[PDB]
Amino acid sequence: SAVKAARYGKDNVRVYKVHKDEKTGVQTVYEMTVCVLLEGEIETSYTKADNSVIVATDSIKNTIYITAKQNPVTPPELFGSILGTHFIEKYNHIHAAHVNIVCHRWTRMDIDGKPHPHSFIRDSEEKRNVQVDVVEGKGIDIKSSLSGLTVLKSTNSQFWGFLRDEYTTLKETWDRILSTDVDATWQWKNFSGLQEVRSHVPKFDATWATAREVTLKTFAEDNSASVQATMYKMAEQILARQQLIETVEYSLPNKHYFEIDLSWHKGLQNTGKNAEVFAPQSDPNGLIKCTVGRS
Amino acid sequence: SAVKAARYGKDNVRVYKVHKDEKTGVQTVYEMTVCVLLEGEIETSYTKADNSVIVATDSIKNTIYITAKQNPVTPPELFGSILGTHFIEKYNHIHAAHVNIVCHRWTRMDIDGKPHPHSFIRDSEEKRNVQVDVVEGKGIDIKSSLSGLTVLKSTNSQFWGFLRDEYTTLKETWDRILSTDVDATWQWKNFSGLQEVRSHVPKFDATWATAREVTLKTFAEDNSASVQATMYKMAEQILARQQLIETVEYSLPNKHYFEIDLSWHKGLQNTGKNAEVFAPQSDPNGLIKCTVGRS
Amino acid sequence: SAVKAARYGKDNVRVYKVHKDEKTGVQTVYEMTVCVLLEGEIETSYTKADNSVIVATDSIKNTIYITAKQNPVTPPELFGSILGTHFIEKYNHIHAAHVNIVCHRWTRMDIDGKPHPHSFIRDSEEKRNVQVDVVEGKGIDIKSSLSGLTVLKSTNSQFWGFLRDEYTTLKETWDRILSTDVDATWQWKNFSGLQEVRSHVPKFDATWATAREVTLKTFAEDNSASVQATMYKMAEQILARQQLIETVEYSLPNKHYFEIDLSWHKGLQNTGKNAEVFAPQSDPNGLIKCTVGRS
Amino acid sequence: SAVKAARYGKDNVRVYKVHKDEKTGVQTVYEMTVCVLLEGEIETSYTKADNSVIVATDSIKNTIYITAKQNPVTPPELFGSILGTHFIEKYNHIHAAHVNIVCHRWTRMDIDGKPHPHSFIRDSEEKRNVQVDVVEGKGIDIKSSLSGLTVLKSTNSQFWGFLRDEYTTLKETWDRILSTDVDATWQWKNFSGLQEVRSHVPKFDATWATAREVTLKTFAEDNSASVQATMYKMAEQILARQQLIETVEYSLPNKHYFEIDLSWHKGLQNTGKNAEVFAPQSDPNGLIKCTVGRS
């Protein structure tokens, strides 16, 4: 037997950082969960009980806090690239670092119509994420994403003209509820190293904001022919607005809301045009994915 | 042996309702999870296998959908009272109904600075809840609550002057992070029946909004001496603003964020005035409760 | 306004303890999650910012570890009573302690048909719990429970003869699946203090084992007329076997498994006597409760 | 823009099946959660709103129930292969099916030392899983796994001799607690189609049982030099016992239990040889992975 692949590190490292402006008194907080996994010439820790090649996962944890102390933690694409680069530069025998960051929302409170200097609210479990792979001699690959963005529209969604055979019971519809949890990932062109990542810093927050805005607007305005058709429109627009993105991937559950026939009860009408009360279904759910790239 | 207490019913009934304004084209959605438990002269179903006294839980489920079809579902205090009253009026041998409703957020989307007519976002897992107990001959008791409101302030929280003995290691502090998930419940004076509940309908949404606003403002503005002292200030203000509330209860976790001493690493300073990077603690947590009533 | 009720303390304190037998080499592990909430003359911490009355929740955490170091942690009824008694004896102004303990399963592994001396498996998320209320001058009240015991029987459950009216669609049945998650609580007679709790130590583990055995056997053997009738049989037997229990409470979800009509597809028969494939329903669920005491 | 990859289908389809032996009266139950995603010539549903190419996800759901009705559901490797093959044979334009199955435990109850004919218990949230990829013209690729197997040993784990630098605070140890949740996957050699999968049916359950047994025994008996070294020993043995497996992958969290220094309290000794009470840490955790194949 032989080791074909190996990676190890620290998962679920929660980190908070505060920035304090001395001039204005305004404070800004960041909270993330970080995972770092390393690869390199570490096979002997598995095969020969040779721990000399192991950077202890506890040390990886320490390094995350130290790096957060000495560097900006925003945008997360930059922080992840700094953190990953550290490991390949510091340890001769480590040749790849894989950094995943989940950013949690702390939105500044408005009190009496004014932004509060040091108080924050968690408005939604929506996350902004990055995956950064730093591979020695191959640069820095960054995938940015948003997840946990949950939306619903109550009309202007249709689904008809699908394949009908002996397995089909679904009725065609010209008016249905459409609800999903959006997971959208945009993959950046490969960067040569940290200097190049630094050179593009302003694009990271702007592209996240664009991806979010395009997602929300397209969802709200499309008279949707299917989840497939609407998601494609989203991806197309993101690629058109940021040339440094190579691909956009969406993964969307179709969270079903079923009509409830109440006609058995005093002829009550609650289907088709008369549908007012619906039963949200926890499971099963449709799952629709697509990756869109350039011609 | 004897049956000392018994209740039964249907839990986790998910319900969605849409309202469509024909004039303006605007749609509004409501989504709730409902639980209904009944009590009454049902002991024989337990002791003698006499199912004749059982309103099937499946029928309770049907009744929830039918009631939602025929009545407004907002404010939830009214819907819960209608639903509970139904059971005690319809079934001679049922003498109490206990209705719990959790309302999920579907907030209308703003697209290009304008409210969208039929598209919604789940902004946070904050819930608005009601517990309604309808007891034959004793009226209607309603407890209203908000839960899952998660906040953090990065300064203007202190904790010093507590009891110190041989079990104490905690250092006094004049500047700490304070973060909590707010669970706040206000208990209404007993109502004589549905007519009286209807007469107070406008107060329900207004009091919820007040409770939320007081919670947020007090949290943001109090230079907090402890969770205990700040929560009391919140409860006092709510009672002062709505005379029909008898008690206010708060239950607040104290979600700790620990300083990280980094001085072992090149004398890096990250404690006290120099603290920038902290470690959020998932557990354990303080838990502080109080019920405030009138003199 | 006035403080009507107040309690505070530490929740979610995870504790592990190991016992090492020097003679046999055998090790035994215990793992629990503990919550302690205190009451007493603490109103001024809320109303006047007087922290002098506060035993810090951090100190409560320390006390839990110290008490676990110096005392047996099994049975949990004894440990909870020791822990609660500590607070009312140590602090003059604290008059009640409320201790909740959840015990996690670590079952010794069998390797090659022999018990291993120091290796354990988590066989199920079933928990054994205690709630201990120690109130100065009123003794010690203990509620013991098991929870998270999930069972299913594929036949020998019936449900017919229930009330039928205009809200009823449920068909009577003489053969259905019955599945539930068992939550069973037995409440001990009040104990005068720690000496009396110590005197009954052997009864705690034995009664837990009896409650579990009666639950499982009755579920498996009863040709069940309803959840109500079967649960009553369980409670009756527990009360008959332990005279020091005053009441038994069961709370049981009815986790539904629905027949799937496949007759639309090539006349395939999958209902009634021909039912083989079913759809488990995540929600809604029946919820049936009962508290049984002595005549 | 162009569609680079696309797949869609139904997730979270819960299925239960019962087998009834008419001769013995014994019943056996199976419960699974199934996901099926399809690929093929479906780009136009995304780009042109052409639903004619879409097998509706609702129809995929129906197909899962129909297939479960007409075929054995055990071993899951066989059921997944039947289900996946169906889609590529039935629909000309579908060229790959991806089937994931999670099998839930329903273990027959022992009542009075005898196996009960129709009553079952969920002993642990451990799962047995399969991933089956059926690709037209490329055969059937099957990955089998176990997950959610949670174990702990209280001694006979060491960790010393790791890299020490200016980022390191971790002390070397010759005696620690080791606890993990095991995720183990074995990848079968590619099968040419369903006939070949059928020919190997007996190997599936036997290999699962072997993988489980090797995991448990090695964990219990290894005087572990690290998670890395112990997991390698596990993987090596599995590959030696089943020649039709190409690779074994383990992914193991290192769930930390920290010593608690109590010496500040009356010189109480609870570290090193005197350690009895520990604090389980919910996060962060080490994460160690390895894929082992043949020379």
Ligand SMILES: O=c1[nH]c(=O)c2nn[nH]c2[nH]1
């Ligand atoms: O078994 C271990 N492997 C590791 O890589 C490690 N790092 N810290 N502690 C550890 N324990």
Ligand SMILES: O=c1[nH]c(=O)c2nn[nH]c2[nH]1
């Ligand atoms: O056992 C049951 N008890 C009930 O009260 C009930 N209601 N519907 N189905 C049921 N099954």
Ligand SMILES: O=c1[nH]c(=O)c2nn[nH]c2[nH]1
């Ligand atoms: O606000 C607080 N209240 C308390 O009771 C406490 N105990 N430790 N820290 C604390 N902070």
Ligand SMILES: O=c1[nH]c(=O)c2nn[nH]c2[nH]1
């Ligand atoms: O938008 C949809 N896409 C689909 O593929 C599908 N299948 N059933 N319903 C559906 N809705």
Ligand code: NA
């Ligand atoms: Na390197």
Ligand code: NA
């Ligand atoms: Na009545």
Ligand code: NA
């Ligand atoms: Na006292």
Ligand code: NA
């Ligand atoms: Na095909």
Ligand SMILES: [Xe]
């Ligand atoms: Xe951070």
Ligand SMILES: [Xe]
């Ligand atoms: Xe609703």
Ligand SMILES: [Xe]
């Ligand atoms: Xe413990």
Ligand SMILES: [Xe]
């Ligand atoms: Xe199944």
